[PDB]
Amino acid sequence: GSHMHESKEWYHASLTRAQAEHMLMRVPRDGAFLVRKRNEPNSYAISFRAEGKIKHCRVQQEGQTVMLGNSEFDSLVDLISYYEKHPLYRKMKLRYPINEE
Amino acid sequence: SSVYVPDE
């Protein structure tokens, strides 16, 4: 569902980019990730570690769906489920959620 | 100046 991520432990709402990097740098591990709401309308970021570096990917909420690049999904939860199964960046998949404390 | 993974 459209707002089902609001009770997912990997979703951190208005966590800042710096706060997200701090969390990802505590015990660095390729495949670690969290999702945050950006300070732009209808915009989220996946913050993650892949191939030894920390990166951020923008996700757009467009009407009822979400878009990552050219790929559309029904919802953020569906997007995250897909990228647990198929690579998000190079060969890295979402594997180790950083949970809200 | 936030750097993100390139679009597309």
From Swiss-Prot, chain A:
List where in the cell it is found: Cell projection, Lamellipodium; Cell projection, Ruffle
Posttranslational mods: Ubiquitinated by CBLB in activated T-cells. Tyrosine phosphorylated in response to signaling via activated FLT3, KIT and PDGFRA. Tyrosine phosphorylated by activated FGFR1, FGFR2, FGFR3 and FGFR4. Tyrosine phosphorylated by activated FLT1 and KDR. Tyrosine phosphorylated by activated PDGFRB. The receptor-mediated activation of PLCG1 involves its phosphorylation by tyrosine kinases, in response to ligation of a variety of growth factor receptors and immune system receptors. For instance, SYK phosphorylates and activates PLCG1 in response to ligation of the B-cell receptor. May be dephosphorylated by PTPRJ.
Question: SH2 domain spans which residues?
Answer: 10-98
UniProt subunit comment: Interacts with AGAP2 via its SH3 domain. Interacts (via SH2 domain) with RET. Interacts with FLT1 (tyrosine-phosphorylated). Interacts (via SH2 domain) with FGFR1, FGFR2, FGFR3 and FGFR4 (phosphorylated). Interacts with LAT (phosphorylated) upon TCR activation. Interacts (via SH3 domain) with the Pro-rich domain of TNK1. Associates with BLNK, VAV1, GRB2 and NCK1 in a B-cell antigen receptor-dependent fashion. Interacts with CBLB in activated T-cells; which inhibits phosphorylation. Interacts with SHB. Interacts (via SH3 domain) with the Arg/Gly-rich-flanked Pro-rich domains of KHDRBS1/SAM68.
What's the entry's take on its domains? The SH3 domain mediates interaction with CLNK. The SH3 domain also mediates interaction with RALGPS1.
Describe the task this protein carries out.
Mediates the production of the second messenger molecules diacylglycerol (DAG) and inositol 1,4,5-trisphosphate (IP3). Plays an important role in the regulation of intracellular signaling cascades. Becomes activated in response to ligand-mediated activation of receptor-type tyrosine kinases, such as PDGFRA, PDGFRB, EGFR, FGFR1, FGFR2, FGFR3 and FGFR4. Plays a role in actin reorganization and cell migration.
Q: What is this protein called?
A: 1-phosphatidylinositol 4,5-bisphosphate phosphodiesterase gamma-1
